[PDB]
Amino acid sequence: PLYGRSFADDKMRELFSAQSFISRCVETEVALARAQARLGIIPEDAAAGITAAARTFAPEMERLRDDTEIVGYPILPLVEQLSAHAGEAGKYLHWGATTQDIMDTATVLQIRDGLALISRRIESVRKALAALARNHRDTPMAGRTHLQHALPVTFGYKAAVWLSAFDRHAARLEEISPRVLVVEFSGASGTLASLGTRGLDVQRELARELNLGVPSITWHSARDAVAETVQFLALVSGSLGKLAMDISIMMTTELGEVAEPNPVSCELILAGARIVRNHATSMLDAMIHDFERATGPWHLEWSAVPEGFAVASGILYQAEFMLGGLQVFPDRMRENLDHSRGLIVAEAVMMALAPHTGRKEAHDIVYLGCRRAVEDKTGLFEVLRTMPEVAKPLGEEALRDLTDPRNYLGSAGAMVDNVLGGR
Amino acid sequence: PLYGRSFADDKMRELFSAQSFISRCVETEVALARAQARLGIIPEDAAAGITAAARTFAPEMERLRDDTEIVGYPILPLVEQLSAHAGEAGKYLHWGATTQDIMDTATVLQIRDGLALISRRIESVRKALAALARNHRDTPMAGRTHLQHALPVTFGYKAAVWLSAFDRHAARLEEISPRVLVVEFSGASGTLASLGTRGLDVQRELARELNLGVPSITWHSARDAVAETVQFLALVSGSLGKLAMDISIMMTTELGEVAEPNPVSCELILAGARIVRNHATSMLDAMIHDFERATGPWHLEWSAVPEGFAVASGILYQAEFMLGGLQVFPDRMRENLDHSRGLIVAEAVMMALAPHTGRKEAHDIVYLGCRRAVEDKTGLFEVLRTMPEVAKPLGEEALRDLTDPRNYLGSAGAMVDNVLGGR
Amino acid sequence: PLYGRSFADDKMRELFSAQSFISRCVETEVALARAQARLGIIPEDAAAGITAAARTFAPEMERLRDDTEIVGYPILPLVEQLSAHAGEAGKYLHWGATTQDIMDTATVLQIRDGLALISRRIESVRKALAALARNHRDTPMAGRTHLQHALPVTFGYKAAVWLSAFDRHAARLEEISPRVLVVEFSGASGTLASLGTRGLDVQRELARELNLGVPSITWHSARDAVAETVQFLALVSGSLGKLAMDISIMMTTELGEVAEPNPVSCELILAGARIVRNHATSMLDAMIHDFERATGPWHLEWSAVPEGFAVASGILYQAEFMLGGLQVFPDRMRENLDHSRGLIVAEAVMMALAPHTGRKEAHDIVYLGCRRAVEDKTGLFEVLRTMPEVAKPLGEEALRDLTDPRNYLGSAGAMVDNVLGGR
Amino acid sequence: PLYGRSFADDKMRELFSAQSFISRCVETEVALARAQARLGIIPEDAAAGITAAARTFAPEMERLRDDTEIVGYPILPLVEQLSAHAGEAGKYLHWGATTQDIMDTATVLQIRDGLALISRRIESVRKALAALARNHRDTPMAGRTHLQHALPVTFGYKAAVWLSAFDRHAARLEEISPRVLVVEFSGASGTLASLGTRGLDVQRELARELNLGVPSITWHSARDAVAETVQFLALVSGSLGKLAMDISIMMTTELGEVAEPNPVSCELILAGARIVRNHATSMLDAMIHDFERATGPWHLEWSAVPEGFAVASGILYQAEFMLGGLQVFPDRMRENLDHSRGLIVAEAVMMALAPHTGRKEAHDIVYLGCRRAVEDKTGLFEVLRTMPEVAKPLGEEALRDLTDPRNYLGSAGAMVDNVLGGR
């Protein structure tokens, strides 16, 4: 279809393409042969022969697609093509393997590449956020609670908040990786029966050959490490959605506080976040995976994994681009901050007044000053100055200072420094 | 409503009750007063007075409920009741705090208790699974792929697979806890402006008083650590759903391989898993939390957190009970394993035959033997014995051995030992 | 829990309470007895006795709750209490019935009341929208596409759009009602075997007694009419969410175009819409209802129906209230419309210019006029007037008229009249 | 990607392809020109010229794709290509139109074709179900409640239940069609300002030209008729999931009651049902469509509509195929029905006994007979015959009859006839 711009990443689509999947499938079968020759399970020349045939092997992709439709899966047709190519040594291919072993393991190999690309995009996101946080550390603007002026903040403060989430997501990525990056090799019902007593030796050797962890046990039907990976994609997408909401709303005509380098990046991010969320939902369904293999639940991973990855990668890329070139308008920010003519810093007059009148009293006086500033379509300073119960204890100069929003930024700057932590 | 049995945990409901929430709210305000007196921000006798008034303070809950409906939130009415009770020292309560600070922080205190109860139930689940895995390590049964006989497995093998997931969930719980268990104290728009330059000192002192971490920055609108907690609840629930599917299907009249101590625990687990999944979905939506506070998204946490916790706790409790007293029937298991009369171990004859005939040939001979056993409504041994291309190379005694499913369990036992790891 | 305001309707909660459910359960059993006495299936005095005992019968609710936990369901304990109360005639109660018959049918009776209350709230919503549409038919304001000024619209036009959706939802409600409002009476596995050949006679008589339709066949496991009802709740909630988005954004400080009578109604509506959506999701899951009864899927209806109803009713009530008393500010609307100083009606100059210069040419001239108005921080009229390729063909008076947004409202008024259709 | 078989329909993919979308886009623009020439809004030769250029027009698809990435949408680039081709008459193209008008309307044209294909597949589904219901009307089998033997049913009875849902879905399709099949033509902010006073005339003429209804008002941001269409797809998918659950479980080795013509159709249906459910979820999100156009929410339709259609069509096709050639095994059905050796018809002995002993007494006697049949691993008849409190009042011949499950099918046959209703 042709509608608009895609939120899916082409690099992440190349990664989960048929050609790439198949080549990881071959990679797995060759490593299995090698693992078995080292453990003396198949002849050493059979593995040598298999290794060499694979160096020169080029699958016949259309034949593969056609046979998959007949057989249900590409693995045994792929083994047939590889066997034909290898001659006599090919008779030792896929020895003790089942289809889900090769498909799970090839999937894990792609997930390794998928996660390196995700990590790379999360690191660019953090970099562009740290720059915004640093450069706009002292750029004042209105803080908003339910879309309405609350107290002054700075734009670097906002960027630091966005950044803090991505610092946490970077940490999550590193925790999830050793759980999901494990080999699958357990055979038709997960017992490796066809290998007699040597099954666990093969499984461990195979992990080593591919540079993967070893699972505690068969995970044909224990899908939690894969589900948590897509859940993680969905969590990152949610954090992208938050900043996309903020930016697209700051692009409102009457605000005009920023501009993207239609907020098209925000559009793609916000739609994509919901689609990734849906892929996480499917993975929670796919976990209800009955007995030793269930084709229904398993089929659900086949969209949720590659598409969760493609879409999450594309919206991270949209965020890298948007945040990297974000146009920030301190002039519009300053103008919007003055919109309430000091009302936004009523709290600062209360704080200053309380030691003189007491706390409830200070609150009552200033809220009265605020109702009148509003009702009289004038500034808070111009109301408060005529009110001797405030003006006399504070003085007019102090009132001018306290009603200037630029003077009430609190720990904003220090909070930014804390998150940046010497970046 | 009155329908059937509840999948929600009453202990987890007491934990998120109004009374408990309110008492954590008071706990937070008192700790805030104490933190401020140590940093010289409020008078030491004001904090002493607040601490003592709180020891004797008992909220007026109906008054609180009524005022919340007027004000929108219980915090300021609760502060009013506590102020009245404390006399003069009460004027220093909620100093520099906003409502979401107290509500977020009190929520975090409940989550600490919620997570200890979740951890406790996950540990009982693992214990009952390890017992099943150990005692039934060698109990043979049919492995099933798409609900059909695949190869022999043991029931302890199945339990070890279920167990392996829960071993991983235990690890996840420990990783998530330091992220979610952090104080919230940042004031009305997250800058602590009302505290001048001392805001971060207060925030850190307050974390110490309550024994919580310190956030990198304000998380009024960065909700990822809370979202990941409910996502985690949903992942555990998914693993409960998998074993509930397996058990309820093994209770099928024609199977009869186990019994619960209607599979009512399986019913509750399986419905509950979908409801927890829905609470995780809501949390991903709640993450799109615009600016410095957005009431819509925030309102979504108010069901998703307490109810995600209550339901996940209740279905973990149902699993503790069911798995702790699971009735396992090795007799029905043995009978179902013999259903195919050796067909389930055709692969074992192939494995044995291959060295004599070659691999494709062995496969073709035995699949032919299998088609005839089926078409002739007899056992595989009785077909193969009359087939000299198998009988002569193997011998009839070997054929009897190879067609007995009890002889083809592979690494099942060793895989169980691996997961148990000296439990 | 105590957090804020509830989005759930108390009337709709009373409707789905245990007491109400139970009383519909009794209503169903009595009607079943009556249906059977008319068809000569049970003695006429047995039905008379049952009818009279039920007039005076008051369930023992705590005993019921306790027994449900033992039995799994309230129906047979409720039949026991009713039997005891009726004396000898009680021995003919629940004759040929199963538990799901009584529970499905009692649920349908509540759904009838639930749908009348939903219809009532949808009619108040439409009324308050028609008033807004009518009174503000000619109130000009900026149209917004991706939150940015597009062309002029009127606020009545916006209200008419919101209204049009609710006109369609009213129609949907009437279509769904005869599908969902049917009796369930089919016995333990849906064949009414215990009634010999008279089962369908009883089922039809029973529908008549309760004033319900007759299903085509047993729907113990065909749940589509119930699922479509909650889906419908979710669709209405979505339309409430749209207008809640619009209103809460129009309450933005810099907009200030309306006010609710924190946009608390918008908060509740927007959170509630997602929760109703989640209840619809659960109903789609509950539809996968295996064989003749499956307790897992069925358990899912037990939250999704009563809670979908309660929440959808509460957010409709919030919308009735908010829209009924909506404060509309034509002054802020007029001010925001002038924000772009005629840029918002560049299209009107193009339209007028095209006959003179051609179409692409008119577009190029005016877009150039627009770039300069922006770059020169002045109004579009003040730029265009100095541009003889526009000023000379059009004349300055015409330019003044064309750059006034109030002159470019198109069919807004007529579109409003169309939707109102003589209301 | 290459994994297994697709659940998406290629015909439905051709329908939502770029080429097809674009050709409907041209169809819309030509009809708009024609509508305008009839109302005297553009010259008659301009429309004639546009009509003729379109007969010969062939878009340059790669150029279109490239320009969409620059412009955001294919509409204005497509208008440019069509203008170039038409010469002078092309200057009247897209007169008063906005991009979403053409894209919404072209989408509606595809939905018309999509719904005809859905209707066609629902009619084949109903046909294959009616055949199964009719041919197996009297084929006895065990009814199952929570996967366990309940009472006898027939397989035609099961098929009639499945059928009844699809009869209702056929009715729903006809109700939804006039709501969703309406033109979109309202211009940039939905007021048709650029057409002065003639906008509604054009909109109505255009509906007539394309053979669509006329909307009550602009639906750029009122998306309920589109959302309800995908919700409907999700409801049908749910009903497919129910029968797919039933069939795949009846393929369990120990059951063996049916076979598909791996239950691969059941796999695809069951995964697809969850994916369609997810597309319905996205549509409920897309409904929160702020102001006069919001690109984020709108972008969500761009996957949910074409993919909801493609997947729902593919799983309907899988069901047509599977149900059309379903292998039904009355022999395995009869064998499983005898599994309980009369226990499954204990209720029939109770029914017969009650007039002699009373009702509670009859229940107690037979449940005792049932406990002993179980504990003694013998048939119910062989226990009951030795029990004079049953044997003497009933007689042994009657006991033999009552313990034969084939004698207890109730209204099964009549219920089948009711649903078939003379098919």
From TrEMBL, chains A, B, C, D:
Gene3D superfamilies: Fumarase/aspartase (C-terminal domain) (1.10.40.30), Fumarase/aspartase (Central domain) (1.20.200.10), Fumarase/aspartase (N-terminal domain) (1.10.275.10). Its EC number is 5.5.1.2. Keywords: Isomerase. One of its GO terms (molecular function) is 3-carboxy-cis,cis-muconate cycloisomerase activity. SMART domains: ADSL_C (SM00998). It holds the Pfam family Lyase_1. Residues 341-420 form the Adenylosuccinate lyase C-terminal domain. Belongs to the class-II fumarase/aspartase family. This is 3-carboxy-cis,cis-muconate cycloisomerase. It comes from Chelativorans sp. (strain BNC1).
